[PDB]
Symmetry: C4
Subunit: 237 residues, 4 copies
């Protein structure tokens, strides 16, 4: 019970370290996990610098984004809650301002798969535009259930969603899957960006997207072990 | 008195280390702080390699950019003084040749906010052009009160100002704020540059700039703690 | 016999470490070597994270891509086997998703030599397109002798071949040669990409490609020693 | 005598380490220094991996590019000799394939100063084209007095010269000056490249080039101390 819970906490901390070391996550970003013992709950670190998060910093939240914990929480915690209630299949949610992906949050050009490693994206990454329903005078943040409800809405049933002029949200069935996807989404965006200025891009076909987006099997763990080893090499625990 | 003064010195040294480790500052760059005990004075390190600056290297300057210290000072110290006298609200001034931002110092394209993290910029970063009043035969440097007076002039009441074909100047109400802003100005410029070659950019609206540029609250310290932790991880003190 | 075999194993491990440290190889990538004692066999690490590969992880495969080893193998092992049987001169094969090169896997613009260091490429890097013979509903992978047979086919007698929307394959007469070529192919692609957006590119002539592509002599070992030293500096063994 | 000579050797080794750590120099690159005791001689490391060069690896060459040393020498040593005899004012010569600068070696767009830090370039960096006098079937190398004589010719009286489809050559009155210039030439090229794709570039005027290119005084040593400190921080001696 408490032993298993500690394991989930450790994985979130590890995922945070990996995302930071691999340049995916910034000072502002956070990853959560649905309590594997109780779907009505999820775990998320208190509002702190990512590089300082430990297992003792994880808070317990309900699907309403509220916690009994007396410590300060992330304002964008509602991004996680709203998605978990709308997507029962999702077990982990990650929010970042991933460098290479960021530009796609404010340009018309859609982020579409260009290599097999990006197939999990689907046709293209959906873009949530807060102006559509709230005008152009908002703070662009996701600090409310209603706004974050629209974000889940735009996400639909896909694997990723971009928040215009803000950042990126990655979802998946496990912390390891979300970390893997976040890493390759970043590499895919970098590749497409380079390609757009080298010549005409020939994208993956809907058929290849369907077929290739299914070979992301034993790959998830290999990636996790690799990035984990890289953490040991850097002495980042 | 001397205890508090040492704290301000330590923060300047830390800020210097952070800016160097995060790739914002180069061999040429420097940050100052208005004496919190005396507005007519400000602190700035003697002319030395940034990586070698210690608390014992900080000099005391008046609003005329002069010091009793017998050690060599930065030639561009006038950039700091002239701004402090024109902007009483400013408590810290930073000058660098921040990589991603640098190109905006010599192209017509204005640096405008594209994500919420850049909202503090305002409509766009003003550009100081020395040729406007001094012709095209100058050294592009800011080594004189009159020239640096025009720089403060171009800065006006904004948060940043670019010196054409030279570098960037960041201002703020605290050392921590300037470090935070300098870091995100660099990330914002990088993002816009990438975006311009990916597709058509949809910028933040004046309304979002006003609203989002106000959520830069508890964020400042989280960033400082994160970059500070990153310094410990690298063994850079 | 076993002493010499261990030396070949050690070189593969070293090459893997070098490619990872130099940013050529990713979590997904692998290098093999034809058994110098038996051409009908080649060596390749079992399916594991590259950063964890040791000499005890190398497997023995026949030219049919099969091993007596009971441990899991790479699915793309057929890429190596099919090339070794078609190219007797090749003693090492490397597969990666080399960052700078990757975009050329999905754009019309051909990767042509622009500096003497890229002369080994030949006129341009051939591109294998799985759609040509298998339609646009495949997984883009090279997990079968027939598909990988076409890859060898597209490679022909050249030094490199790109697998559309997938990755890159480097071949050579020695592990050291393939590592050298993989490193410079990455630098060459980076250079051309930068050049295409700076101005009009004046490529190497067929004559320079022939003459310059022959000075890659004692250079191979200097590079190997340099990257090997860089590994010691980083404490990566 | 031998004490002073050792100091010159130490500086060359340090410069090599700095250029490697700052990403200016690659496996292939080398720096030399005119013997301050005898202008008819210059020092250059034997043909080895840059990361392995020590004071005991430096060779003595005459202005004909020949040495009594029995150890292998760099084939491009003639690049250094030919320049020293044509430019008595030059005391150090550096050859590299500096990343950001490299593209300018094969595109029509000239590398012109865009910030005060690049003023030392002059109007633009001259480009040596081997095809002009030797056709398009050469190895693009500088392995002969006659060819290298033309390189010195193209260099003229400037501070830098590009060898088409090959690399870059930096000259100066001291090892420290060449290291400083090589570092900023790289940053300047990076900046211009970024700028060209952001908008219309407003270059430094001939007047600013003349005036700003003279403030490169005490700056040289600050840079040297900074990069030297950075070497200690990395434990690279
Ligand atoms: Mn956010
Ligand atoms: Mn400056
Ligand atoms: Mn692959
Ligand atoms: Mn060369």
């Amino acid at each position: 019970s408490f032993t298993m819970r500690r394991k989930v906490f450790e994985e979130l901390v590890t995922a945070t370290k990996i995302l930071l070391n691999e340049g995916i996550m910034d000072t502002f970003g956070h990853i959560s996990a649905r309590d594997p013992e109780d779907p009505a709950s999820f775990f998320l670190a208190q509002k702190l610098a990512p590089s300082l998060i430990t297992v003792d910093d994880i808070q317990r939240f309900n699907l309403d984004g509220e916690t009994s914990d007396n410590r300060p929480s992330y304002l964008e915690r509602y991004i996680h809650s709203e998605i978990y209630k709308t997507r029962p299949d999702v077990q982990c949610v990650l929010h970042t301002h991933s460098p290479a992906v960021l530009p796609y949050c404010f340009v018309d050009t859609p982020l579409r798969p260009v290599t097999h490693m990006g197939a999990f994206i689907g046709e293209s990454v959906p873009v949530y535009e807060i102006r559509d329903k709230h005008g152009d005078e908002t703070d662009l943040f996701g600090g409310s259930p209603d706004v974050c409800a629209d974000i889940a809405e735009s996400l639909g049933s896909q694997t990723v969603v971009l928040m215009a002029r803000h950042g990126v949200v990655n979802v998946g069935k496990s912390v390891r899957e979300v970390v893997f996807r976040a890493f390759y989404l970043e590499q895919e965006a970098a590749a497409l960006t380079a390609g757009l200025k080298i010549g005409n891009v020939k994208y993956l076909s809907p058929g290849e997207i369907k077929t290739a987006g299914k070979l992301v099997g034993a790959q998830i763990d290999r990636g996790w072990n690799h990035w984990s080893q890289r953490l040991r090499q850097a002495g980042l625990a």
